[PDB]
From a paper:
Lysosomal fusion is fundamental to cell survival and requires HOPS, a conserved heterohexameric tethering complex. The heterohexameric HOPS complex mediates fusion of late endosomes, autophagosomes, and AP-3 vesicles with mammalian lysosomes or vacuoles in yeast, and is probably the best-studied tethering complex. Five out of six HOPS subunits (Vps11, Vps16, Vps18, Vps39, and Vps41) are predicted to share a similar architecture, comprising an N-terminal β-propeller and a C-terminal α-solenoid domain. At the opposite sites, Vps41 and Vps39 bind to membrane-anchored small GTPases (the Rab7-like Ypt7 in yeast), while Vps16 and the SM protein Vps33 establish the SNARE-binding module.
Here, we used cryo-electron microscopy to reveal the structure of HOPS. To enable high-resolution cryo-EM of non-crosslinked HOPS, we vastly improved and accelerated our purification protocols and removed any delays during the sample preparation procedure. Single-particle analysis including extensive classifications followed by local refinements led to a composite structure with resolutions between 3.6 and 5 Å. HOPS forms a largely extended, slender structure extending approximately 430 Å in height and 130 Å in width, resembling a triangular shape. In the center of the modular complex, Vps11 and Vps18 align antiparallel through their elongated α-solenoids, establishing a large interface area of 1972 Å2, which resulted in the highest resolution obtained within HOPS and is comparable with protein interfaces in other complexes with similar structural elements as in HOPS. In our model, the two core subunits create a central assembly hub for the four other subunits (Vps39, Vps41, Vps16, and Vps33) that fulfill specific functions and localize to the periphery of the complex. Vps41 and Vps39 provide the Ypt7-interaction sites at their peripheral N-terminal regions. Their extended C-terminal helices, similar to those of Vps11 and Vps18, are tightly interlocked through coiled-coil motifs with the long C-terminal α-helices and RING finger domains from the respective core subunits (Vps41 with Vps18, and Vps39 with Vps11). Vps33 is in immediate contact with the structured loop of Vps18 (residues 824–831) that connects the elongated helix with the RING finger domain. Overall, the SNARE binding module appears to be stably connected to the central core, while only the short C-terminal section of Vps16 α-solenoid (residues 739–798) displays high variability and is not resolved in our structure. Multi-modular classification analyses revealed angular re-orientations of about 9° for Vps41 and 20° for Vps39 relative to the core, resulting in variable positions of the N-terminal β-propellers.
Author numbering:
A (entry chain B): 3 to 708, 713 to 739
B (entry chain D): 1 to 106, 112 to 124, 150 to 351, 374 to 492, 502 to 522, 542 to 623, 638 to 691
Write the structure that this text describes.
Amino acid sequence: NPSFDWERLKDVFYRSRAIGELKWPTQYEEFKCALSLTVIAVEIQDFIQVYNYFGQLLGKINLQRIHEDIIKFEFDKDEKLILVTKSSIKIVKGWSPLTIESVPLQDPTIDTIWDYHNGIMLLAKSRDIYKLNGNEWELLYENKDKKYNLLTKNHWSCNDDSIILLDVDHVYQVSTSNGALLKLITDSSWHKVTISSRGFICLYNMKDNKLQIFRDPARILMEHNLDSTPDDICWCGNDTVACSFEDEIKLYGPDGLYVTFWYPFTVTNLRAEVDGLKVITTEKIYFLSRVQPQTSNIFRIGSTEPGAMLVDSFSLLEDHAPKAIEILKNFVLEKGVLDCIAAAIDEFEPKLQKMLLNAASYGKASLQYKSFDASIFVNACNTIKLLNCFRSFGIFLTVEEYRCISLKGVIDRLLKYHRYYECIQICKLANERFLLGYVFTEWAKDKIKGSPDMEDDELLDKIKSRLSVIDMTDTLQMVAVAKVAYLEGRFQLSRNLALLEKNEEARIEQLYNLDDDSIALKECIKVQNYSLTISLLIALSKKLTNSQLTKLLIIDMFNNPLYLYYMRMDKAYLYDFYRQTDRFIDLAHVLLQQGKEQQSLHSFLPQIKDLYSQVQNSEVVNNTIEQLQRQEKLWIYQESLGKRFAISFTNMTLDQTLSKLIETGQDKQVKEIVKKFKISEKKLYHLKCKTLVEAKKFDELLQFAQPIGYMPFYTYLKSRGHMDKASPYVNMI
Amino acid sequence: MNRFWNTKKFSLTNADGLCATLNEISQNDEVLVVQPSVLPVLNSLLTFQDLTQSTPVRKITLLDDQLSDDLPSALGSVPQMDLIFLIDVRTSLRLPPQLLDAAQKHHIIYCRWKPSFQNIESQLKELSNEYTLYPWDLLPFPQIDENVLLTHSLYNMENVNMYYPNLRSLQSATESILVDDMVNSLQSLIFETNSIITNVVSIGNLSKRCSHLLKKRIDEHQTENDLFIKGTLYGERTNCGLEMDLIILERNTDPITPLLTQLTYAGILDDLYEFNSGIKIKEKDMNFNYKEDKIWNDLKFLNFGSIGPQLNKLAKELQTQLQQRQAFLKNHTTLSSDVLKVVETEEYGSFNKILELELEILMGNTLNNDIEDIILELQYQYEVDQKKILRLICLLSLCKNSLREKDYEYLRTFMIDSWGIEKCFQLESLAELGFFTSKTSKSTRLQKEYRYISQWFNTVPATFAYSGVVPLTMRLVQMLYDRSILFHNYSSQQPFILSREPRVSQTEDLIEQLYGDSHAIEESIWVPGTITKKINASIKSNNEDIALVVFLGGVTMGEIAIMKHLQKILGKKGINKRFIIIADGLINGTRIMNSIS
């Protein structure tokens, strides 16, 4: 039974375990140190060393001589060292390419930084309250007369909302979002505070030991008058408060009782995690967790819960198999299945994890067909599989923390120290794909931002080679990789990197913004999305010149008149374009369309005749000019009729102008038209016959009858308003 | 698919889309500003009374030039009721000039095909910021029949046939925009019904580009796992399996049929008067809705010689029997009264003159020297319109593969004399398109005398759609599922007789002599039967066939009724198929000539 100690305060059990193992066992433990979740930073002379919990030296920030006094250093949320100087604050953004981003005070000439703790900062001379909201000191609280009297640097704290600051006589308070005083208690002689993640405020007196944890003023939740002053009044997650007397940590609890966890070695530092109280010794690291109800029932001595007897039933399957099926029937085999699953995730040792999941899977199938979904079991196995993979890489995370910060938090904490391959396996092990993209693009970002002298030819292979192995989509985001290449100035592969995107819109947009517009236009033809290409051209015309557009269009868009169709309404642009492009047949129709649009073809007609005379590289062109040369004789001859007959003839066809001569009545001019213009014998008859039958009983056809076969003379008379007098043509046939 | 390829749902879904989007813009009164080229589309989905009920819009305006001084009048109405523009830039790539111009002198809804996987505007950036873009998802809804879907992609705001643009230099990009629009529209139908496209057949060079682009935009979306789930989960009718024909044809494959005189009741009405996007005649109008007018459904594809006599039966049937039906019987009688009288009087009749004359070319009876008197008599003796000759002249060239040089320059010269110099550019565009040529991206064109076609495909024996001539488009579709047409005139090598699936085997040689190339027809199969289809089919089987016929470039109303006859004749012979005629607009002889210039 693992319940060797499992001490209780009043009703809940408390356990101590072993987390990792340290490899200092020297002055390093005594030397200043800090913890966030995986790493510990100790200052060894002028050599700040960051060790994970398993004694692996990940990074090493040698002090750049000194250049500024280094009083303290912590980690805020992402394991970024926040070295604080008397003059300014220098966060850390890289470990191989050490790129400390110094954040200075706006006015570093009067005051100076006095303390820094999880963002909110406090000046020295005028005790102001600032906040690190980025690369600046975003002010939160303004000074006043008699603001506060912190006896020593250890008189304040803050986690995310409350900035409780311990005055000499009162206990003031500030909130980040507003920055206002919320005085709690008028009388106070308190000397410490360890506000937790949830907000449970602690206190201490150190004159008479009076640990007085609260949740809000006007209320006391515990008042144990402990005996000896402690060393580190840490927090046990969100529940209880511990101490550190020599090698004696005591998890205090309600109603004046405590549980003692003796340790072989001394106690150096205590980190209050979300659900634990990680305790550092010189040799190894401990974890004063709290026993959940699931494990408090399964593994309790002399237990009777459905969770416990399922484990007993499994332990009897080996030799008493016919004697272990009856135990299942006795109890409710629904709490037992879930208790084992929810307690296997908590346990750290792989041996108990495999037995507990065996116990649940043994009783899991003794339920109804659809009693409960098995996804609870598979999810539990996947969660346990991941939390045991992180242990191989030095990151120890409980179930609570791995869900408080998602897989991105673990990937972020590993990308800092350039462990990209490990992040690849973790993303694959979690069966995730979005994080797989975020891992790769960061690697490609750093390689481009890294080796500057590496030539383009080999470099392009490196990104391509690693991309091929990884199978993923919609998260590679090569445009981010292209931008990084653009920033570094290696724009040669920037197109090349742009050309390897599966999103057509992003590939074209990036190529356009890279100003390789000639290549961008050509590639858009391949996609054949004419909606997209016409959108690029109108955007391309916004910044290029009028002539430069034409130079690009002729060379690359020769046989693709898409942009012209976009401006078919603007005959002005198409006119000068076609002559400059040296297209003459095409230019004629634009001239033609103006004639039909404005209802005047003569005003353009000789000009069209000019254009067909500048190509000569066809056979239909010789036919069209002939129908134009013959039209010239038709037009010039029309003024001849207007100069001797005083009749308008403009804009009249040969067919219409001959009919007019028959209405008035001529002899040779109608015959002059026929022989000069090569008018057939047949067409002359019908044209006047149609005209004559409209001339109100002309009767001249008998005088005209002297090659239509003599038949249609009847029909014009018969089938029109001349039914009468048809008899003469009846016998004429 | 059977319960999902219900075209009536498409019309109601699109109506719900506009109403849902309209309300969220504003709740006070609104004035809709509707582009003229899209107005008949809205009135097909919903009427004025319906629109004002679920939406606050009370007045609809047009983007014509009249909305410039009226815009100021609308500007006063803008304070009373919000202005929401409605534009369509899918096939124009450019906003209506009046809309942008009116913005600088005194909310836009832009149509868009339904999104495929997720579920142009920089022009107005010059005007001002804070512009609001609310897309209107659209699907091709039935307008003339249950099985006929139009996308209205053939025409843009200028009303230029995208397949035959008037500006001849732009046919390399005007044509290719239409194909890109067809694929987007087809994706809208494919993903909405969750259909899986089986073997595909395409005829014509342009058709291949539509199939390949569709395959690229479908392959990039779905995978084999994504294919197994869709077919098995979605019922699949558990009868036979998966089958989705995608016969794709283009107009140039059969250019003779648009040049013929239509005879179906909805063809003559389309021949004399121009239907628009909403299938409503402008000069005399009624609700040409197949859903409402129950009589319109039973008469819209009969031969016009039968509409008259069959209306006596419908009229006397109500005698023994309604008020809504009472107006319907007289309305179609008046339409059959107005149309019939126009037949024998306009152009001195000539409706029977043209019909019997067309046959004299379709069997090669009209000899070379007779062209002089036949063309001349029509223009002068009968006073027939210019288009009715220019359409007939184009028929002469196509049904003899060319014209002799003696007559080719004769007809060209004669057309110039009778109708001015403008015809030397109308007759020039015809020659380039192959409609009127001579002996002297390389799209497909007919290259054979119609004597051979009439002999082979038995186009001149079911001949009710036109003047006693089956369209060659029906024969091309029929020769896939049914080789009985060939087996009596072009036989001794037919692989089979009746095939459920469309087959192109042993017919590539026929096209080589016909269109001048053997590679015009290709059947690039998709997910290959028992390898992926029957494995999915038999999976859900233990543990009819929609045959989309895409018409690139427009379908004449005589080729719509001839598929319904084709669908029926296939049903009795064993190959039971349902034909959904996806197209891009209505095309006639008069529509072509107004677009060729």
